[PDB]
Specification:
Number of helices of chain A: 4
Strand order of the largest sheet of chain F: 4-8-6-7-5
Strand content of chain A: under 5%
Keywords: transcription, transcription-dna complex
Oligomer: part of a larger assembly
Number of domains of chain A: 1
Organism of A: Escherichia coli
Largest sheet of chain F: 5 strands, mixed
PDB class: transcription/dna
CATH superfamily of chain A: RNA polymerase subunit, RPB6/omega
Chains: A mainly alpha (72), B mainly alpha (247), C mainly alpha (102), D mainly alpha (72), F alpha+beta (1344)
CATH architecture of chain A: Alpha-Beta Complex
Entry title: Escherichia coli RNA polymerase promoter unwinding intermediate (TRPi2) with TraR and rpsT P2 promoter
CATH class of chain A: Alpha Beta
Radius of gyration of chain F: 40 Å
Number of helices of chain F: 41
Helix content of chain A: 55-70%
Number of strands of chain A: 0
Order of helices and strands of chain A: HHHH
Structural class of chain F: alpha+beta
Helix content of chain F: 25-40%
Distance between the termini of chain F: 17 Å
Bound molecules: chapso, magnesium ion, zinc ion
Shape of chain F: globular
Chain A: DNA-directed RNA polymerase subunit omega
Structural class of chain A: mainly alpha
Strand content of chain F: 5-15%
DNA sequence: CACAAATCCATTGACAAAAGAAGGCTAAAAGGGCATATTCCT
């Protein structure tokens, strides 16, 4: 983890980025999931921002996963 | 030994350091000449001759030292105390000119420009454009770091307002003044600011929960009410004023 | 002094505060004693919570535990003595052995 | 940085404006009056030669200097 | 203080703004040691207990 | 969870509702045990227990007794913290008056009862009665009496008086008066007395009374009868080691008031004489009044300490008080300090850390990890083992720190770049490392300066620090898009030493297969680091759509530049490292790298440039030697010449030719000229003294002197200080500004004798003394900027308006001081940008002008760009993101949430330090170059010479180039001798206007004869005949020159013809007779002939830059010489004469001109009384006030005046700052406003209210069928615009706390938390930043 | 199947103890008064 320009490539405003990386890192640290990207022995924030950096996570994917969890 | 920065002299116009390190280089060169003469146990007469010619040069210099009432009994001592380097003087405004400095530099066989060729230790290859050396008289100011470096995880807390103390004697934490709050507002840091001024400093019930969640690997933070604001509530309300926190 | 305008009261510390570590300790205590008290018998696990001031407005005296458990003012101390005598096992209740420092 | 590194800037600004004022207070060029204005009487050509632009003889200029000395 | 063989030159950024780069020969010749004899007191105030 | 903080007056039943009992005794504690007293100022029953879960008598000491209050000691057993929460009350023996409604400035009880404050003072302190139910004898409620009058009213009747004196009297005054009655009364007594003072006064007072009305507050609540005491804990009585104690002054103040209350009680049951009891009542009013506050009362009644006792309100206000100091600026856990050192090895995205500090701040983290690993048992074991510091904790620490950032921070945090987050690197030793390219961002050297490190605890905090605050994301300054990671002080010297041609060195003039072979050839010792060389390279000049098209060449260049190329990334062209590469150029290089190739490549290239520059400055061995400070051989010559000159002036002064007060100035100018000469000589002898001889003959190159190399490089220092080394060193002015005429002819390479050093000491002392005082207010203008525009944040995304400013370069006839590039880079065009071909729409409506559009305009040369400012953004409570623009640290469009108010403040502030702290001070339009000419507002005629001359006023010249732009403009005054016309492609170096300060003419519009009117001698004027040659003329005379027998006349040389009329000016209904003011120098005598445009009568007649010039400039303070202008646009004409000031009115074209005021002739008129001047036209003198720019030329001018006024203070300093920020403070300066008509409104017409209420109201009323309403735009200075605030917590924190509170108290104000200063206080999230989501969703919660 | 002990929870029944509210002691605080005349400082 070095720079978060790519995180502006994924979403915009650079604030929902941080506040959604925090939610995904909640899911990943407080055990509710594991990451979709192979963490190279990194801290939870690092993994959250990385898998955001793959177009794999943002507000919509997280919320639709939320609804799928609501199926339980 | 010490490697200063050569850029200090133009901006900080203090030519004293260049000029003094040149003169000190001359003084230590005279000292090294005496030590070569001495440890080799050259003589007493030749040692006397050299020291005598060293103690006089420069036009009408006010002191007059000579080796008549000496010696030997004295010039062995006056060498053994000058073997580390002939200590020089310079009055505050009637000092030695550049010229007498260069004459010292010529007495011992150092370069008159005061500058040597030096060789980089790591690469072993030689710098360009010779660098200046010489014996500057450095000091050790008592801004010593290991009574300066200081930090606290969770120390004690002041009585009236529930905030950490101020002093390194009492483990005070760093002040998060008014300019830093603006600095964080200028960014988007808001949870940072919220923790910095709620759970790290003021809140009584959030700081304990915060510590617990730290040890439990859950990096959450429960806000609560800043205790300073509760004191300000009791103070505003201590007058005949009813301030309250509406629903 | 300091010309910093720090008043005297700005350095007088508190003594009512629970040391934030010591709260962090105690949260494992009621957890850890909950651990051994988990692997207890329902009588011993309940009677010890009965005998000691655990997880309630509590500390019912030994006659008072003799009434609720309906056994005996004398018999309770027997199972109470039986309680920690089983818990006095090294290599069985070593968790609270962590909460000892001589 | 270090306060001497700044204080030199303060000092040089002060003295630069000093030299600028005291060098601008000399009149540059113009048609000499040949006569002190306060008296209409001749300003001798030596004074006409030194400051090209003088408009007072020594006496009326001395009077004006003494009057401005009290700043009002 | 004490006089050191000093040179004026950059040398790889360790003296960037106002820094200094002392040789280990300085700190190994014990040439800048000091003695800080600091003191610690302790009272015995008989309290109510 | 709460919201909408509230405040109001407190009822006695309210205050009884708070308490848990009433203090009676003035005892506090037991002096033998330290237990509280029975019901003293520390009670058991009242304020609760003393220790955790026990009574005070000891009857109950378990947690199982929770809640039950004991029966002997009666103390409610609960937590001991409850003493911090309870409150006590006091039942005063008699009423007494609250100081805040009594002695505050606007006197809340003063104008609540029609009275002067001294009258109620005489009432309160038992001096003279006040009548209530005073019968129908003489009074009803108001007028005061005396004891003679009190007894002669008690005389002849005991009934029918019913008056008291003091507290009870005022209490019956308030408790009797009704609100609605008086409001309706003075309502009727208002519109029949709405005279200009009476109207506003009574209207404001009735406003206060109606505010009292709708509040439900009762005036008698103002006077106190029950007084509430703080809890004990907030006024503790801590025990000090050694038997002593420490209390707060609140304790003894409470004690004294309780003592006076007990005494008055004892007096009342005695029925002692009323004199003694009245003194008691007075004393208790004194005590309570000094309790609530110490200032209004005369003497702060001190104690045995020779200091004043510190009362209640002093614990809220002031610097020291809770608000300003402890409620925002508070210490922090998990934070540490240290000394900073450099350690240049480590990358920009990280900082070294001492290992001890690292193991301290992250203690709880390491405990958590050691328990997660099972390497310990419990937390106690973990702490014990980390205190042992065994091996495992080091690996645990290296693991937990790994991606966990820390904040660095310095003492003077000016701008947001003063706080940046780094990734730790565990270091032994006790210093704090730092990437040297970040010192400049911090503005900290390494003379022992100390940062502090805070730990981001929360995971949202960790992400905030990394994604928003980490140094690598923050490289571009916020006050201007310039990268602020530039090579600072030493890597620039290394890089400059690297890229430097010398005519001959090793391996001169070979060919190299690439940069790599250059490096291989240099390190092997076969070519020099800088030898001129032909080199083959390959540059990746990306031209196509993201296509990196390579293309090679054989560049002829230095070996050094070829080496340095290997660290340049793919983007740039080789022509960037193909120069000397000083300090400026390398900053430009980083700027271009960012501009071309993104961010991450620029950060990687920044670290590379630092690494390589450091390494080659190491290789350079760049030293400074005493031989290297060259003295010019021709210095003593110049010294002898200048000493000859000073002797010459002295000789003449003894010859009686000059004043001493000019001998001074002559010798000063002599020495200054000699100084500049010496500097030029020394530069010539040093800048290029190096001669070298390749192939025989010698050639000239720039010097290799390593002081010159550190000045030409711009690394540190400049040419001037190097002068101060070798040449003569100035003149060394005294502290004030008196220069000492005998210079310091020495230099520093030579010595300075005692008087030279002493003369130096004056300036050195003053400079150091005033640089230690910009520290005393490092953050004063920053504070007073933040506390006005802090509550302003980008909130929406686009407001869809079209307004803005028309940007044009800042050129004043010289060279372009600010091109259209900078003033438009990064803004949003409000309309299209049309090429002068009038059909080329270039940027439609919302194209953010990045470098590319502004480039395209640059080579297209369109200079008319209507760009949407912030100040005209239509948004409410904020600003359109698209309106603000893009100038972030990040290059992209601003994003909603950004607290642009605060960054505007910190950008307009922190370079303010780079300014000078003290306010320092400092004819014909000759065309300077080639082009055409354009006269704007060119209202002129073919004049007497058949040529052009200004008959208009605001004709502004323009060097018209054929590009489609304005090359170089000028101002042309009235009646200027236009030696040409308009639309002439002219040559260069030509004066096309001329005019005289002693000839401001009144030249004729058209022809005529010299046929006078009213020009009568002895009655109006003097028959002047300047008979040195004999010319007679009728010059106009002013009224002190005209007699009284002609003063009611208007002199004029009437325009006529050869027939007998008065030829009327076509366009007006007046015949032409040029009325003339005083001093109207006339020549043409009666009957002479003239023609069109002839000389009728040609009447005769420094910029600052300091910092406090700026705070004033941001205040709209009325300068000494305001310039009023026309409110009407039309033909003007005079009026009455000298009622102290002349009179004259600007007549409309068709309407009415009722506009006239006291125009003093000390301020000279520039227009006659016969011109059609429009509103906003120059009539008055001196500096225009910024207010009138708004009220006359609108908001856009007052902002274009203010940004173009404060920018040039930075401009005159050499400082750079973007213009976007100086608007966002403007937008706060004009937030208030006043009304034009109520219409469908709900306020007074002649009233003032902030813009947004109007802005939401009458835009909504158009939605309704109702009428819109009109409003005047006010304008307030920042500290005056800052007090006007919708909150009442954002105001208490910074302004006069008592003034805000009583007003917001009586007003019953309710603050709903918004803005950034309040949410910090309450400690919830901020509305602005990351917490913009958290605060909108409250609106959804506040929307149901 | 089928008889004899170890000992389970059940008392049972003695003792040693701890405190718990009153009872005696007593030192502490509190109050209650003393007139030749001292007459506006801070
Ligand atoms: C030394 C100081 C460096 C700080 C950066 C420089 C930076 C800009 C300089 C001023 C400007 O040039 C304008 C003006 C020119 C006049 O000629 C002399 C006065 C002025 C005010 C100058 C004084 C001084 O020289 C200044 C403050
Ligand atoms: C550091 C500071 C001086 C620096 C100038 C000195 C001056 C007076 C010192 C305090 C006081 O003695 C009261 C108190 C006495 C306790 O017993 C120990 C704690 C207290 C708070 C002391 C700590 C400290 O030592 C103080 C603040
Ligand atoms: Mg510093
Ligand atoms: Zn004269
Ligand atoms: Zn009790
Ligand atoms: Zn906008």
């Amino acid at each position: 983890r070095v720079t978060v320009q790519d995180a502006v490539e994924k979403i915009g405003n650079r604030f929902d980025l941080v506040l959604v990386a925090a939610r995904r890192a909640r899911q990943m640290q407080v055990g509710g999931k594991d990451p979709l990207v192979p963490e190279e022995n990194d801290k939870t924030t690092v993994i959250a921002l990385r898998e955001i950096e793959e177009g794999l996570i943002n507000n919509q994917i997280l919320d639709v996963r939320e609804r799928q969890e609501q199926q339980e | 030994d010490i490697v200063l920065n050569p850029l200090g002299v133009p901006s900080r116009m203090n030519i004293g350091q260049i000029l003094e390190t040149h003169l000190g280089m001359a003084a230590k060169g005279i000292g090294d000449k005496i030590n070569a003469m001495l440890k080799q146990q050259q003589e007493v007469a030749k040692l006397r001759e050299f020291i005598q010619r060293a103690y006089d040069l420069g036009a009408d210099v006010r002191q007059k030292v000579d080796l008549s009432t000496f010696s030997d009994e004295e010039v062995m001592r006056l060498a053994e105390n000058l073997r580390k380097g002939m200590p020089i003087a310079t009055p505050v405004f009637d000092g030695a000119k550049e010229a007498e400095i260069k004459e010292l530099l010529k007495l011992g066989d150092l370069p008159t420009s005061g500058q040597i060729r030096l060789y980089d230790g790591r690469t072993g290859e030689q710098f360009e454009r010779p660098v200046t050396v010489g014996y500057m008289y450095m000091l050790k100011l008592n801004h010593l770091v290991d009574d300066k470096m200081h930090a606290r995880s969770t120390g004690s807390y002041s009585l009236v307002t529930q905030q950490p103390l101020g002093g390194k004697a009492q483990f005070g934490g760093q002040r998060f003044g008014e300019m830093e709050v603006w600095a964080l507002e200028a960014y988007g840091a808001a949870y940072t600011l919220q923790e910095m001024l709620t759970v790290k400093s003021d809140d009584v019930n959030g700081r304990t929960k915060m510590y617990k969640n730290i040890v439990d690997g859950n990096h959450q933070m429960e806000p609560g009410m800043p205790e300073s604001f509760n004191v300000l509530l009791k103070e505003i309300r201590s007058l005949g004023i009813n301030i309250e926190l509406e629903d | 002094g300091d010309d910093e305008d720090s008043h005297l009261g700005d350095f007088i510390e508190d003594t009512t505060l629970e040391l934030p570590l010591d709260s962090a300790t105690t949260e494992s205590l009621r957890a850890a004693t909950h651990d051994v008290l988990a692997g207890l018998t329902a009588r011993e696990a309940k009677v010890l919570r009965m005998r000691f001031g655990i997880d309630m407005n509590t500390d019912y005296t030994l006659e008072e535990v003799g009434k609720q458990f309906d056994v005996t003012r004398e018999r309770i101390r027997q199972i109470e003595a039986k309680a920690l005598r089983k818990l006095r096992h090294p290599s069985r209740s070593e968790v609270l052995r962590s909460f000892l420092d001589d | 940085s270090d306060e001497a590194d700044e204080a030199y800037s303060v000092t040089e600004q002060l003295t630069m404006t000093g030299i600028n004022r005291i060098r601008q207070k000399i009149n540059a060029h113009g048609i000499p009056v040949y006569l002190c204005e306060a008296c209409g009487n001749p300003i001798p050509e030596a004074r006409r030669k030194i400051f090209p632009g003088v408009t007072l003889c020594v006496e009326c200029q001395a009077y004006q200097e003494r009057q401005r000395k009290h700043y009002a | 203080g004490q006089n050191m063989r000093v040179a004026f030159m950059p040398w790889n950024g360790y003296n960037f703004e106002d820094s200094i780069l002392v040789s280990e020969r300085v700190v190994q010749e014990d040439r800048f040691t000091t003695i800080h004899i600091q003191e610690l007191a302790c009272v015995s105030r008989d309290t109510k207990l | 969870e709460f919201d909408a903080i509230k405040i109001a007056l407190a009822s006695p039943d309210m205050i009884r509702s708070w308490s848990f009992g009433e203090v009676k005794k003035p005892e506090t504690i037991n002096y033998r045990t330290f237990k509280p007293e029975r019901d003293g100022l520390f009670c058991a029953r009242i304020f609760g227990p003393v220790k955790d879960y026990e009574c005070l008598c000891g009857k109950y000491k378990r947690l199982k007794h929770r809640g039950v209050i004991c029966e002997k000691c009666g103390v409610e057993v609960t937590q001991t913290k409850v003493r911090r929460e309870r409150m006590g009350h006091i039942e005063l023996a008699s009423p007494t008056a609250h100081i805040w409604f009594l002695k505050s400035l606007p006197s809340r009880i003063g104008l609540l009862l029609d009275m002067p404050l001294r009258d109620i003072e005489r009432v309160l302190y038992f001096e003279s009665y006040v009548v209530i139910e005073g019968g129908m004898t003489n009074l009803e409620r108001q007028q005061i009496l005396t004891e003679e009058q009190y007894l002669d009213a008690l005389e002849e009747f005991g009934d029918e008086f019913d008056a008291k004196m003091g507290a009870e009297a005022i209490q019956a005054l308030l408790k009797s008066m009704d609100l609605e009655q008086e409001c309706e009364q003075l309502r009727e007594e208002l519109n029949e007395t709405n005279s200009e003072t009476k109207r506003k006064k009574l209207t404001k007072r009735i406003k206060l009374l109606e505010a009292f009305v709708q509040s439900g507050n009762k005036p008698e609540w103002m006077i106190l009868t029950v007084l509430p005491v703080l809890p004990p804990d907030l006024r503790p009585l801590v025990p000090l080691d050694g038997g002593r104690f420490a209390t707060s002054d609140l304790n003894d103040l409470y004690r004294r008031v309780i003592n006076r209350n007990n005494r008055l009680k004892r007096l009342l049951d005695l029925a002692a004489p009323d004199i003694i009891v009245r003194n008691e009542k007075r004393m208790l009013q004194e005590a309570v009044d000094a309790l609530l506050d110490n200032g209004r009362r005369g003497r702060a009644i001190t104690g045995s300490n020779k200091r004043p006792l510190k009362s209640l309100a002093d614990m809220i206000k002031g610097k020291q008080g809770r608000f300003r100091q402890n409620l925002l600026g508070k210490r922090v856990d998990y934070s540490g300090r240290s000394v900073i050192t450099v350690g240049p090895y480590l990358r920009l995205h990280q900082c070294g850390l001492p290992k001890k500090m690292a193991l301290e701040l992250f203690k709880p983290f390491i405990y958590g990890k050691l328990e997660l690993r099972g390497l310990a048992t419990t937390i106690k074991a973990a702490k014990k083992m980390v205190e042992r510091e065994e091996a495992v904790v080091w690996d645990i620490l290296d693991e937990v720190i790994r991606e966990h950032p820390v904040l660095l921070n310095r003492a003077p945090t000016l701008h947001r770049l003063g706080i940046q987050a780094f990734e730790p690197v565990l270091i032994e030793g006790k210093a704090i490392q730092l990437h040297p390219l970040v010192c400049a961002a911090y503005n900290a050297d390494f003379d022992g300066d100390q940062m502090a490190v805070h730990v981001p605890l929360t995971l949202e905090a960790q992400l905030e620090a990394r994604a928003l605050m980490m140094s690598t994301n923050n490289i571009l300054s916020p006050a201007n898009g310039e990268p602020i990671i530039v090579p600072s002080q030493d890597v620039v010297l290394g890089l400059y030493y690297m890229t430097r041609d010398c005519v001959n060195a090793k391996g001169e003039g070979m060919v190299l297969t690439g940069p790599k072979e250059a490096e291989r050839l240099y390190r092997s010792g076969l070519a020099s680091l800088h030898a001129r060389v032909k080199v083959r390279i390959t540059e990746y000049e990306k031209d196509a759509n993201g296509e990196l098209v390579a293309k090679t060449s054989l560049k002829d260049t230095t070996v050094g530049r070829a080496i340095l190329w290997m660290i340049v990334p793919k983007g740039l062209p080789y022509s960037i490292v193909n120069q000397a590469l000083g300090k400026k150029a390398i900053s430009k290089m980083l700027n271009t790298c960012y501009r071309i190739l993104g961010l991450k490549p620029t950060v990687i290239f920044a670290d590379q440039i630092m690494y390589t520059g450091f390494a080659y400055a190491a290789r350079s061995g760049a030293s400074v030697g005493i031989d290297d400070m060259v003295i010019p051989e021709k210095k003593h010559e110049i010294i002898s010449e200048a000493e000859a000159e000073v002797a010459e002036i002295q000789e003449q002064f003894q010859s009686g030719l000059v004043t001493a007060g000019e001998r001074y100035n002559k010798v000063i100018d002599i020495w200054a000229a000699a100084n500049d000469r010496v500097s030029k000589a020394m530069m010539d002898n040093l800048q290029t003294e190096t001669v070298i001889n390749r192939d025989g003959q010698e050639e000239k190159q720039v010097s290799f002197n390593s002081i010159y190399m550190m000045a030409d490089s711009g690394a540190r220092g400049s040419a001037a200080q190097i002068r101060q080394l070798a040449g003569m060193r100035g003149l060394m002015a005294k502290p004030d500004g008196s220069i000492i005429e005998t210079p310091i002819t020495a230099n520093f390479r030579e010595g300075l004798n005692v008087l030279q050093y002493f003369i130096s000491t004056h300036g050195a002392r003053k400079g150091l003394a005033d640089t230690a005082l910009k520290t005393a207010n490092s953050g004063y203008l920053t504070r007073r900027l933040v506390d006005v525009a802090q509550d302003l944040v980008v909130t929406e995304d686009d407001c869809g308006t079209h307004e803005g400013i028309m940007m044009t370069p800042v050129i004043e006839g010289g060279d372009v001081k600010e091109p259209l590039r900078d003033r438009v880079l990064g803004r949003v065009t409000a309309e299209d940008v049309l090429k002068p071909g009038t059909a080329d729409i270039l940027v439609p409506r919302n194209t953010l002008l990045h470098e590319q559009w502004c480039d395209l305009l640059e080579e297209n040369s369109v200079d008319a760009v209507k760009v949407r400012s912030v100040v005209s953004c239509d948004t409410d409570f904020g600003v359109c993101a698209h309106c603000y623009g893009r100038d972030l640290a990040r290059g992209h469009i601003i994003n909603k949430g950004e607290a642009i108010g605060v960054i505007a403040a910190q950008s307009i502030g922190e370079p303010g330090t780079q300014l000078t702290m003290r306010t320092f001070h400092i004819s014909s339009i000759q065309v300077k170059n080639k082009g055409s000419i354009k006269l704007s507002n060119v209202k002129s005629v073919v004049n007497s010479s058949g040529k052009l001359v200004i008959t208009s006023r605001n004709t502004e010249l323009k060097l018209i180039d054929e590009f489609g732009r304005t090359k170089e403009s000028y101002k042309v005054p009235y009646g200027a001798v236009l030696a040409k016309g308009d639309g002439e492609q002219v040559a260069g170096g030509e004066t096309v206007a001329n005019w005289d300060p002693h000839t401001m003419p009144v030249i004729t519009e058209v022809s005529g004869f010299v046929r006078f009117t009213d020009m009568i001698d002895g009655q109006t004027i003097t028959r002047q005949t300047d008979e040195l040659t004999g010319l007679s003329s009728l010059v106009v005379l002013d009224s002190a020159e005209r007699t009284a027998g002609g003063k009611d006349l208007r002199p004029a040389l009437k325009i006529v013809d050869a027939q007998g009329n008065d030829v009327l000016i076509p366009g007006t209904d007046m015949p032409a007779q040029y009325f003339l003011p005083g001093k109207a120098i006339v020549q043409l005598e009666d009957g002479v002939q003239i023609s069109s445009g002839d000389t009728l009568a040609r009447i005769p007649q420094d910029i600052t830059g300091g910092l406090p010039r700026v705070a004033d400039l941001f205040e709209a303070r009325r300068p000494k010489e305001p310039a009023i202008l026309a409110e009407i646009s039309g033909i003007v004409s005079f009026g009455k004469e000298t009622k102290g000031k002349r009179r004259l009115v600007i007549t409309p074209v068709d309407g009415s001109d009722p506009y006239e005021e006291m125009i003093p002739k000390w301020r000279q008129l520039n227009v006659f009384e016969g011109e059609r001047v429009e509103r906003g036209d120059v009539i008055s003198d001196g500096p225009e006030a910024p207010h009138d720019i708004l009220r006359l030329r609108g908001v856009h001018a007052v902002t274009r005046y203010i940004v173009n006024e404060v920018q040039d203070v930075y401009r005159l300093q050499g400082v750079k700052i973007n213009d976007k920020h100086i608007e966002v403070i403007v937008r706060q300066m004009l937030r208030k406003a006043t009304i034009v008509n109520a219409g469908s409104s709900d306020f007074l017409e002649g009233e003032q209210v902030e813009y947004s209420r109007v802005k939401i109201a009458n835009r909504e009323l158009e939605a309704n069928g109702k009428v819109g309403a009109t409003y005047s735009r006010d304008l307030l200075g920042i500290t005056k615009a800052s007090l006007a605030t919708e909150s009442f917590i954002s105001a208490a924190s910074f302004q006069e706390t008592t003034r805000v509170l009583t007003e917001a108290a009586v007003a019953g104000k309710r603050d709903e938390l918004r803005g950034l200063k309040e949410n910090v206080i309450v400690g919830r999230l901020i509305p602005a930043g990351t917490g913009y989501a958290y605060h909108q969703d409250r609106m959804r919660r506040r929307a149901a």
